[PDB]
Amino acid sequence: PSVKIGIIGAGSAVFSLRLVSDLCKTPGLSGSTVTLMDIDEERLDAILTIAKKYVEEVGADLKFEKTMNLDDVIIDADFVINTAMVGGHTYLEKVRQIGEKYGYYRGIDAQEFNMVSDYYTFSNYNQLKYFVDIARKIEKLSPKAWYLQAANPIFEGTTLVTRTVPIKAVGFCHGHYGVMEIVEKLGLEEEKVDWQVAGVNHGIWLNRFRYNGGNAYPLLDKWIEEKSKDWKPENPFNDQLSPAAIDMYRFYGVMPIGDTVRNSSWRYHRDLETKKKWYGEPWGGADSEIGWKWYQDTLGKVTEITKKVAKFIKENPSVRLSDLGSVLGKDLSEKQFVLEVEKILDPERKSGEQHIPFIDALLNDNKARFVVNIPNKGIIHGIDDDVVVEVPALVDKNGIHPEKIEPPLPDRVVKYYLRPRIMRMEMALEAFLTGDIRIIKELLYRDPRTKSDEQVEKVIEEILALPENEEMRKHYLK
Amino acid sequence: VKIGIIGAGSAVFSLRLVSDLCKTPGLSGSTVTLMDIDEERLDAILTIAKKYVEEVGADLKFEKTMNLDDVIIDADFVINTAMVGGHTYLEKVRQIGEKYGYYRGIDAQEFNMVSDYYTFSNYNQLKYFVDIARKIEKLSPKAWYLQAANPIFEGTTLVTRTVPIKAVGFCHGHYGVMEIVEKLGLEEEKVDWQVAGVNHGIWLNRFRYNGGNAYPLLDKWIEEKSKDWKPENPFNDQLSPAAIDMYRFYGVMPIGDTVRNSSWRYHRDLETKKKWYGEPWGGADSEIGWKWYQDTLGKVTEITKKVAKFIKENPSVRLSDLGSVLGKDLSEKQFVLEVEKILDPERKSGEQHIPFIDALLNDNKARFVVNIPNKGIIHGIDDDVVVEVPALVDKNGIHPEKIEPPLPDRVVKYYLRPRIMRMEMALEAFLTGDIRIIKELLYRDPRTKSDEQVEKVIEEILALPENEEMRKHYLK
Ligand SMILES: NC(=O)c1ccc[n+]([C@@H]2O[C@H](COP(=O)([O-])OP(=O)(O)OC[C@H]3O[C@@H](n4cnc5c(N)ncnc54)[C@H](O)[C@@H]3O)[C@@H](O)[C@H]2O)c1
Ligand SMILES: NC(=O)c1ccc[n+]([C@@H]2O[C@H](COP(=O)([O-])OP(=O)(O)OC[C@H]3O[C@@H](n4cnc5c(N)ncnc54)[C@H](O)[C@@H]3O)[C@@H](O)[C@H]2O)c1
Ligand SMILES: OC[C@H]1O[C@H](O[C@H]2[C@H](O)[C@@H](O)[C@@H](O)O[C@@H]2CO)[C@H](O)[C@@H](O)[C@@H]1O
Ligand SMILES: OC[C@H]1O[C@H](O[C@H]2[C@H](O)[C@@H](O)[C@@H](O)O[C@@H]2CO)[C@H](O)[C@@H](O)[C@@H]1O
């Protein structure tokens, strides 16, 4: 039979096309039916146009279905992948501005160890509620389907779903590929490196880093001593080897990986100039207003180009996606988009997203190593059983088999980084589940940016008064 | 039985143990060795102590020593009430912190506002706890180490994790329960209560009366009488707005010093302290309230020196008759009465050290609130973190109570865990000598504005003359 895979938030083109192309490149999953769902009809139609073109151009037999309805993407599904962001970037920025208006630089959701700009955990009640609503619908309509959480917040979200809805659920992220930048900068062969990461999503550490039967951190130490002085970031997100990362490594004893670097204490984020010092010129990292605008702009351009490409495919039914950049111009935006298209068109190249390989491991026993977000259940020492952690695991027809963490994470990481980060995840979930507004007020009473009780009352009142937050306000009413 | 007391110059503490020892028939015949480095305060307490013993006719031998080894050898119990550096060092360091923008000093942290409860700048104090403990292990391995000196939480956790001797911490904070009982008008013998947490971080997890939940009675009091509440002194904050507010969030009442140990919300500035802890002092941890307390300490020491002098000037006179020889001088007669008041207050002191010793040696069993390694008593806390919980003590030792109902999750997750993390920082800095731990505490402090501020406040504290070994310890 045809494996049914549903994608919520399918309008996110690059992601959907990566999943679609990976499926086409996976023998055991050929013939699958992909239901694409979104609330934005234009973005939805655009991805359907491009995905259908792709499948035909490459000779695949993948079938598609379109819907704007949650029930249709879930009914009969074997896997449900959620990449939706309720409220979009417009909601994120309106809230951030309200925060800054009341003295909270970068918004109230930016907290010690969670500076990632689109990783809201308190003001995005609607996003958290959608995760739960999807999970409950899966429980009711397709009880044996897997819920694959791709949207942020992955840590809070996956913990919330696994603790409250009895379905199979896992979160997936690309964060760990930061390991590959370190390996390449040290001139080491990836296949010769024995690595392991552990922590929570966007809060992971390189607990094991060996090369040729020995601890390889000395090689990183050599790189820091001899070459870090010449280090420069290529874009706002290129901070794996920034002063912030190195300094965290020096204190904790292991390297923070990926977005974990952005998720430092307030020390590296007191102001723009401080951000530039730790994350590099000219942006001050992805989470400054400069760096975040850089990001928002690239996203806008990607959506523009997708819409253009879709339009053109419909008007020029004979054009081939491989005739890319003959239709598209040559500005940075377009050239990058063509590189992406070429990678998805290459039959021997997988995208790197873990969703499809995960499905193939489970259904066809093509086992592989994954970095997954699952309930801890003792994997990481010192963390509660029901806290979702991000760790490596072998996955096969018999399911997810967590690796043993070794060497274990250093005590400093567990005691001084993960524990406070978990405490704020616990507050976010307790506020969400109980509707007790004093949990959110407590988070702000302890926030270093808070100067008075009036400030806390006002920022909360304004966020709860936004039109899209009517049910959130009622949920929090005493 | 030999009992050694380190820091015996701590007048109130010493005279209260003297008084209780005299009233404990089971410990008659005991030898008490008083030790301090301040010869003057030491002689005064020894002079008053022997004079009191004579008076009431108790059978106790009191001696003094300025030597740590002598107070420990042959001892069955070693009680530490000493504060290395004294209040002088405390204020010296606090002034430095404030110079660099840390109101009330860098040791004032979320959930640890108690002004004399230093945990990072008082390296010398922490090292003494360990030095005392190692000597006990060396010289009198079977002695019990009883810690009265602060910080009890960090200190007792430090000692129990590193030295294999019997150690327990004792405090009087839990008595806040009695104030609640009295204000609600309840018969004490009908109240079934329990507290649990860490030292100066305990909560009334159980509060029942005649078998039913008694919190509704506190709710009644809050709703009908709190608006008329006013504190009698800077420390009288058990039923303050701060306490009530913590109770409303956490679900259980914070007890004793726990009330002082709130988040920065109630301590942003003096006016905020007044709002939460009451007029006119703003609690014991404002500059006004703390000064009020410092004044009481100075007064007590002056009193004991004046009286010790009179005792020597009038060798044949009994303590209770000393006023009789000071003639028309009411001030001097009042000094003697002041001292007698310390020895025999109108209401019992409640100090647990003597009862504890009597419980262990003579099996005169009782309920105590002790600081001991957790070992699963409080769920969610590591086995080697020292907690403050109730226990039955008898000939067979300490018998911890089962905590029931358990502390609410909010208390464990949002109060104890962060508090414990800072205890872990304090201990790691002390044990490893890695100054980056102390810098990390300050990088996260809401009062910190820059790296240079952190470097300089730490450098100045490390450059004090009393801190040469501390500076050496944190080097490299
Ligand atoms: N931007 C990225 O490349 C990226 C990478 C990794 C993870 N994520 C996470 O994925 C989520 C979305 O990513 P984004 O930045 O492209 O945001 P986005 O606003 O573009 O959301 C993407 C898709 O979600 C759809 N959507 C919104 N509300 C929906 C609803 N109620 N039901 C179904 N679909 C809905 C949108 O219309 C859109 O097509 C966020 O939580 C984000 O943090 C994004
Ligand atoms: N557990 C409780 O119930 C409780 C109650 C009040 C105070 N305290 C604690 O008791 C300690 C002292 O209280 P205090 O206000 O009297 O302080 P203090 O400094 O005035 O007196 C303590 C005594 O320590 C002595 N001392 C200093 N260094 C010494 C050393 N190296 N060896 C021996 N003795 C030494 C002093 O000379 C002094 O007589 C502090 O840590 C304080 O926080 C605890
Ligand atoms: O905060 C935005 C987005 O950032 C991260 O993803 C980055 C990734 O780290 C970069 O290496 C590059 O691949 O672009 C990504 C965004 O396209 C977070 O991992 C992600 O969750 C977050 O939404
Ligand atoms: O911070 C000084 C001192 O305060 C507390 O002791 C109080 C006690 O709680 C009161 O009940 C009353 O007895 O006065 C004491 C001060 O004399 C702390 O409990 C103690 O540890 C601390 O040193």
PDB file of N, CA and C in Angstrom, chain A residues 112-113 250-252 265 267 270 277-278 384 412 415-417 419-420 423 426-427 430 434 436 438-439 442 444-446 448 450-453, chain B residues 110-111 245 248-250 263 265 268 275-276 382 410 413-414 417-418 421 424-425 428 432 434 436-437 440 442-444 446 448-451:
ATOM      1  N   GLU A 112      17.486  34.001  29.094  1.00  0.00           N
ATOM      2  CA  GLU A 112      18.780  33.357  29.307  1.00  0.00           C
ATOM      3  C   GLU A 112      18.672  31.950  28.684  1.00  0.00           C
ATOM      4  N   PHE A 113      19.613  31.573  27.819  1.00  0.00           N
ATOM      5  CA  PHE A 113      19.623  30.266  27.158  1.00  0.00           C
ATOM      6  C   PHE A 113      18.516  30.020  26.106  1.00  0.00           C
ATOM      7  N   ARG A 250      35.163  26.935  26.841  1.00  0.00           N
ATOM      8  CA  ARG A 250      36.153  27.053  27.908  1.00  0.00           C
ATOM      9  C   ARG A 250      35.528  26.899  29.290  1.00  0.00           C
ATOM     10  N   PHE A 251      34.359  27.489  29.485  1.00  0.00           N
ATOM     11  CA  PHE A 251      33.704  27.350  30.776  1.00  0.00           C
ATOM     12  C   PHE A 251      33.076  25.955  31.027  1.00  0.00           C
ATOM     13  N   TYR A 252      32.261  25.471  30.083  1.00  0.00           N
ATOM     14  CA  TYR A 252      31.574  24.192  30.242  1.00  0.00           C
ATOM     15  C   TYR A 252      32.426  22.937  30.016  1.00  0.00           C
ATOM     16  N   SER A 265      23.911  33.032  27.951  1.00  0.00           N
ATOM     17  CA  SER A 265      23.338  33.853  29.014  1.00  0.00           C
ATOM     18  C   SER A 265      23.209  35.298  28.497  1.00  0.00           C
ATOM     19  N   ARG A 267      24.937  37.728  29.211  1.00  0.00           N
ATOM     20  CA  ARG A 267      26.257  38.335  29.084  1.00  0.00           C
ATOM     21  C   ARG A 267      26.646  38.731  27.647  1.00  0.00           C
ATOM     22  N   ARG A 270      23.784  41.907  26.067  1.00  0.00           N
ATOM     23  CA  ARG A 270      23.308  43.094  26.783  1.00  0.00           C
ATOM     24  C   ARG A 270      22.884  44.208  25.827  1.00  0.00           C
ATOM     25  N   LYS A 277      30.631  41.978  19.642  1.00  0.00           N
ATOM     26  CA  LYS A 277      31.852  41.473  20.266  1.00  0.00           C
ATOM     27  C   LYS A 277      31.914  39.936  20.368  1.00  0.00           C
ATOM     28  N   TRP A 278      30.807  39.324  20.728  1.00  0.00           N
ATOM     29  CA  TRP A 278      30.824  37.875  20.905  1.00  0.00           C
ATOM     30  C   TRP A 278      30.468  37.055  19.679  1.00  0.00           C
ATOM     31  N   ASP A 384      14.899  15.026  34.509  1.00  0.00           N
ATOM     32  CA  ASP A 384      13.689  14.217  34.705  1.00  0.00           C
ATOM     33  C   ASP A 384      13.320  13.329  33.490  1.00  0.00           C
ATOM     34  N   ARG A 412      28.946  20.698  34.774  1.00  0.00           N
ATOM     35  CA  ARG A 412      28.629  22.117  34.618  1.00  0.00           C
ATOM     36  C   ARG A 412      27.531  22.320  33.606  1.00  0.00           C
ATOM     37  N   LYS A 415      24.179  21.181  35.406  1.00  0.00           N
ATOM     38  CA  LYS A 415      23.841  22.068  36.531  1.00  0.00           C
ATOM     39  C   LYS A 415      23.618  23.531  36.212  1.00  0.00           C
ATOM     40  N   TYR A 416      24.457  24.078  35.345  1.00  0.00           N
ATOM     41  CA  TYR A 416      24.381  25.520  35.084  1.00  0.00           C
ATOM     42  C   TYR A 416      23.774  25.974  33.747  1.00  0.00           C
ATOM     43  N   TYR A 417      23.574  25.037  32.826  1.00  0.00           N
ATOM     44  CA  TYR A 417      22.976  25.387  31.556  1.00  0.00           C
ATOM     45  C   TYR A 417      21.610  24.709  31.385  1.00  0.00           C
ATOM     46  N   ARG A 419      19.702  22.774  33.478  1.00  0.00           N
ATOM     47  CA  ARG A 419      18.710  22.942  34.549  1.00  0.00           C
ATOM     48  C   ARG A 419      17.949  24.267  34.513  1.00  0.00           C
ATOM     49  N   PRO A 420      18.637  25.404  34.336  1.00  0.00           N
ATOM     50  CA  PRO A 420      17.860  26.655  34.288  1.00  0.00           C
ATOM     51  C   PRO A 420      17.010  26.699  33.011  1.00  0.00           C
ATOM     52  N   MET A 423      14.024  24.746  33.671  1.00  0.00           N
ATOM     53  CA  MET A 423      13.095  25.453  34.542  1.00  0.00           C
ATOM     54  C   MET A 423      12.196  26.383  33.706  1.00  0.00           C
ATOM     55  N   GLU A 426       9.660  24.450  31.939  1.00  0.00           N
ATOM     56  CA  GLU A 426       8.605  24.026  32.889  1.00  0.00           C
ATOM     57  C   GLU A 426       7.622  25.161  33.138  1.00  0.00           C
ATOM     58  N   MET A 427       8.133  26.386  33.234  1.00  0.00           N
ATOM     59  CA  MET A 427       7.221  27.529  33.423  1.00  0.00           C
ATOM     60  C   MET A 427       6.320  27.727  32.205  1.00  0.00           C
ATOM     61  N   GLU A 430       3.748  24.980  32.306  1.00  0.00           N
ATOM     62  CA  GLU A 430       2.777  25.143  33.387  1.00  0.00           C
ATOM     63  C   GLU A 430       1.811  26.299  33.086  1.00  0.00           C
ATOM     64  N   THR A 434      -2.096  25.336  32.853  1.00  0.00           N
ATOM     65  CA  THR A 434      -2.955  25.816  33.938  1.00  0.00           C
ATOM     66  C   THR A 434      -3.709  27.121  33.672  1.00  0.00           C
ATOM     67  N   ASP A 436      -2.542  29.833  34.539  1.00  0.00           N
ATOM     68  CA  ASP A 436      -2.222  30.702  35.676  1.00  0.00           C
ATOM     69  C   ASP A 436      -1.258  31.794  35.203  1.00  0.00           C
ATOM     70  N   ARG A 438       0.142  34.129  36.719  1.00  0.00           N
ATOM     71  CA  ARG A 438       1.274  34.459  37.588  1.00  0.00           C
ATOM     72  C   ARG A 438       2.485  33.661  37.334  1.00  0.00           C
ATOM     73  N   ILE A 439       2.447  32.616  36.507  1.00  0.00           N
ATOM     74  CA  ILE A 439       3.670  31.909  36.097  1.00  0.00           C
ATOM     75  C   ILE A 439       4.449  32.818  35.147  1.00  0.00           C
ATOM     76  N   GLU A 442       5.846  35.596  36.988  1.00  0.00           N
ATOM     77  CA  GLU A 442       7.021  35.179  37.750  1.00  0.00           C
ATOM     78  C   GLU A 442       8.285  35.174  36.885  1.00  0.00           C
ATOM     79  N   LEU A 444       8.873  37.076  34.402  1.00  0.00           N
ATOM     80  CA  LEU A 444       9.280  38.478  34.242  1.00  0.00           C
ATOM     81  C   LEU A 444       9.753  39.119  35.556  1.00  0.00           C
ATOM     82  N   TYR A 445       9.212  38.712  36.711  1.00  0.00           N
ATOM     83  CA  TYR A 445       9.700  39.307  37.966  1.00  0.00           C
ATOM     84  C   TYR A 445      11.198  39.003  38.170  1.00  0.00           C
ATOM     85  N   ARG A 446      11.650  37.858  37.648  1.00  0.00           N
ATOM     86  CA  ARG A 446      13.046  37.384  37.746  1.00  0.00           C
ATOM     87  C   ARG A 446      13.927  37.776  36.590  1.00  0.00           C
ATOM     88  N   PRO A 448      16.209  39.878  34.244  1.00  0.00           N
ATOM     89  CA  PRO A 448      17.101  41.000  34.548  1.00  0.00           C
ATOM     90  C   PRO A 448      16.654  42.345  33.966  1.00  0.00           C
ATOM     91  N   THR A 450      13.510  43.498  33.969  1.00  0.00           N
ATOM     92  CA  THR A 450      12.388  44.004  34.737  1.00  0.00           C
ATOM     93  C   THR A 450      12.832  44.972  35.862  1.00  0.00           C
ATOM     94  N   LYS A 451      12.181  46.123  35.888  1.00  0.00           N
ATOM     95  CA  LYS A 451      12.498  47.160  36.856  1.00  0.00           C
ATOM     96  C   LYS A 451      11.343  47.450  37.805  1.00  0.00           C
ATOM     97  N   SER A 452      10.146  47.040  37.425  1.00  0.00           N
ATOM     98  CA  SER A 452       9.002  47.296  38.285  1.00  0.00           C
ATOM     99  C   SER A 452       7.834  46.334  38.024  1.00  0.00           C
ATOM    100  N   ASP A 453       6.873  46.290  38.942  1.00  0.00           N
ATOM    101  CA  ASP A 453       5.687  45.463  38.753  1.00  0.00           C
ATOM    102  C   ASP A 453       4.766  46.013  37.678  1.00  0.00           C
TER     103      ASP A 453
ATOM    104  N   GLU B 110      19.291  36.116  44.570  1.00  0.00           N
ATOM    105  CA  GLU B 110      17.905  35.644  44.540  1.00  0.00           C
ATOM    106  C   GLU B 110      17.836  34.427  45.484  1.00  0.00           C
ATOM    107  N   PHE B 111      16.876  34.459  46.408  1.00  0.00           N
ATOM    108  CA  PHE B 111      16.684  33.396  47.405  1.00  0.00           C
ATOM    109  C   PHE B 111      17.768  33.315  48.475  1.00  0.00           C
ATOM    110  N   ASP B 245       2.410  36.831  49.848  1.00  0.00           N
ATOM    111  CA  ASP B 245       2.532  36.763  48.399  1.00  0.00           C
ATOM    112  C   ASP B 245       3.245  35.476  47.968  1.00  0.00           C
ATOM    113  N   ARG B 248       0.775  32.711  48.350  1.00  0.00           N
ATOM    114  CA  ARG B 248      -0.160  32.692  47.238  1.00  0.00           C
ATOM    115  C   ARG B 248       0.415  32.064  45.949  1.00  0.00           C
ATOM    116  N   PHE B 249       1.704  32.261  45.685  1.00  0.00           N
ATOM    117  CA  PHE B 249       2.292  31.691  44.463  1.00  0.00           C
ATOM    118  C   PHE B 249       2.656  30.231  44.620  1.00  0.00           C
ATOM    119  N   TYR B 250       3.370  29.943  45.695  1.00  0.00           N
ATOM    120  CA  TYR B 250       3.870  28.590  45.944  1.00  0.00           C
ATOM    121  C   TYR B 250       2.862  27.577  46.511  1.00  0.00           C
ATOM    122  N   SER B 263      12.872  36.493  45.766  1.00  0.00           N
ATOM    123  CA  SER B 263      13.552  36.893  44.541  1.00  0.00           C
ATOM    124  C   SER B 263      13.878  38.400  44.644  1.00  0.00           C
ATOM    125  N   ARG B 265      12.504  40.735  43.215  1.00  0.00           N
ATOM    126  CA  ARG B 265      11.307  41.550  43.135  1.00  0.00           C
ATOM    127  C   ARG B 265      11.020  42.389  44.388  1.00  0.00           C
ATOM    128  N   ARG B 268      14.340  45.431  45.209  1.00  0.00           N
ATOM    129  CA  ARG B 268      14.932  46.299  44.192  1.00  0.00           C
ATOM    130  C   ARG B 268      15.579  47.547  44.779  1.00  0.00           C
ATOM    131  N   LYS B 275       7.638  48.217  51.157  1.00  0.00           N
ATOM    132  CA  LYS B 275       6.339  47.793  50.678  1.00  0.00           C
ATOM    133  C   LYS B 275       6.095  46.324  51.038  1.00  0.00           C
ATOM    134  N   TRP B 276       7.118  45.510  50.857  1.00  0.00           N
ATOM    135  CA  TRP B 276       6.973  44.076  51.093  1.00  0.00           C
ATOM    136  C   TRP B 276       7.236  43.551  52.502  1.00  0.00           C
ATOM    137  N   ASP B 382      19.056  16.086  44.868  1.00  0.00           N
ATOM    138  CA  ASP B 382      20.090  15.063  44.974  1.00  0.00           C
ATOM    139  C   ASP B 382      20.345  14.564  46.400  1.00  0.00           C
ATOM    140  N   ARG B 410       5.859  23.556  42.593  1.00  0.00           N
ATOM    141  CA  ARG B 410       6.355  24.913  42.352  1.00  0.00           C
ATOM    142  C   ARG B 410       7.500  25.241  43.278  1.00  0.00           C
ATOM    143  N   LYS B 413      10.646  23.146  41.924  1.00  0.00           N
ATOM    144  CA  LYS B 413      11.110  23.580  40.609  1.00  0.00           C
ATOM    145  C   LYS B 413      11.557  25.037  40.501  1.00  0.00           C
ATOM    146  N   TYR B 414      10.820  25.929  41.129  1.00  0.00           N
ATOM    147  CA  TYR B 414      11.083  27.376  41.009  1.00  0.00           C
ATOM    148  C   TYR B 414      11.783  28.066  42.172  1.00  0.00           C
ATOM    149  N   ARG B 417      15.380  24.435  43.422  1.00  0.00           N
ATOM    150  CA  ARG B 417      16.352  24.158  42.368  1.00  0.00           C
ATOM    151  C   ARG B 417      17.280  25.329  42.057  1.00  0.00           C
ATOM    152  N   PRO B 418      16.754  26.553  41.889  1.00  0.00           N
ATOM    153  CA  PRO B 418      17.661  27.677  41.607  1.00  0.00           C
ATOM    154  C   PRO B 418      18.579  27.956  42.829  1.00  0.00           C
ATOM    155  N   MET B 421      21.233  25.439  42.847  1.00  0.00           N
ATOM    156  CA  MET B 421      22.263  25.714  41.844  1.00  0.00           C
ATOM    157  C   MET B 421      23.313  26.698  42.389  1.00  0.00           C
ATOM    158  N   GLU B 424      25.599  25.034  44.700  1.00  0.00           N
ATOM    159  CA  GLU B 424      26.556  24.235  43.906  1.00  0.00           C
ATOM    160  C   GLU B 424      27.661  25.143  43.366  1.00  0.00           C
ATOM    161  N   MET B 425      27.316  26.336  42.895  1.00  0.00           N
ATOM    162  CA  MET B 425      28.365  27.268  42.423  1.00  0.00           C
ATOM    163  C   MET B 425      29.343  27.612  43.561  1.00  0.00           C
ATOM    164  N   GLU B 428      31.503  24.606  44.285  1.00  0.00           N
ATOM    165  CA  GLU B 428      32.472  24.321  43.229  1.00  0.00           C
ATOM    166  C   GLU B 428      33.597  25.376  43.236  1.00  0.00           C
ATOM    167  N   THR B 432      37.323  23.944  43.758  1.00  0.00           N
ATOM    168  CA  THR B 432      38.231  23.938  42.599  1.00  0.00           C
ATOM    169  C   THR B 432      39.166  25.133  42.493  1.00  0.00           C
ATOM    170  N   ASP B 434      38.358  27.721  40.889  1.00  0.00           N
ATOM    171  CA  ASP B 434      38.151  28.319  39.568  1.00  0.00           C
ATOM    172  C   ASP B 434      37.341  29.598  39.697  1.00  0.00           C
ATOM    173  N   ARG B 436      36.309  31.484  37.595  1.00  0.00           N
ATOM    174  CA  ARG B 436      35.263  31.652  36.579  1.00  0.00           C
ATOM    175  C   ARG B 436      33.873  31.278  37.095  1.00  0.00           C
ATOM    176  N   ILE B 437      33.803  30.506  38.173  1.00  0.00           N
ATOM    177  CA  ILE B 437      32.495  30.163  38.746  1.00  0.00           C
ATOM    178  C   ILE B 437      31.896  31.417  39.361  1.00  0.00           C
ATOM    179  N   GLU B 440      30.845  33.790  36.762  1.00  0.00           N
ATOM    180  CA  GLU B 440      29.602  33.318  36.119  1.00  0.00           C
ATOM    181  C   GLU B 440      28.376  33.727  36.923  1.00  0.00           C
ATOM    182  N   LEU B 442      28.124  36.285  38.800  1.00  0.00           N
ATOM    183  CA  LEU B 442      27.951  37.724  38.531  1.00  0.00           C
ATOM    184  C   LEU B 442      27.540  38.061  37.090  1.00  0.00           C
ATOM    185  N   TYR B 443      28.008  37.289  36.101  1.00  0.00           N
ATOM    186  CA  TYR B 443      27.562  37.548  34.727  1.00  0.00           C
ATOM    187  C   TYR B 443      26.048  37.394  34.640  1.00  0.00           C
ATOM    188  N   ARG B 444      25.498  36.478  35.440  1.00  0.00           N
ATOM    189  CA  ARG B 444      24.044  36.242  35.421  1.00  0.00           C
ATOM    190  C   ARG B 444      23.244  37.138  36.380  1.00  0.00           C
ATOM    191  N   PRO B 446      21.310  40.145  37.963  1.00  0.00           N
ATOM    192  CA  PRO B 446      20.587  41.260  37.326  1.00  0.00           C
ATOM    193  C   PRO B 446      21.245  42.632  37.501  1.00  0.00           C
ATOM    194  N   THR B 448      24.474  43.196  37.251  1.00  0.00           N
ATOM    195  CA  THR B 448      25.670  43.304  36.432  1.00  0.00           C
ATOM    196  C   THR B 448      25.380  43.971  35.086  1.00  0.00           C
ATOM    197  N   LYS B 449      26.215  44.945  34.739  1.00  0.00           N
ATOM    198  CA  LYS B 449      26.046  45.706  33.507  1.00  0.00           C
ATOM    199  C   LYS B 449      27.202  45.507  32.549  1.00  0.00           C
ATOM    200  N   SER B 450      28.327  45.025  33.045  1.00  0.00           N
ATOM    201  CA  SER B 450      29.479  44.853  32.160  1.00  0.00           C
ATOM    202  C   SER B 450      30.486  43.901  32.759  1.00  0.00           C
ATOM    203  N   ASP B 451      31.369  43.381  31.910  1.00  0.00           N
ATOM    204  CA  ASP B 451      32.434  42.487  32.334  1.00  0.00           C
ATOM    205  C   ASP B 451      33.457  43.193  33.238  1.00  0.00           C
TER     206      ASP B 451
END
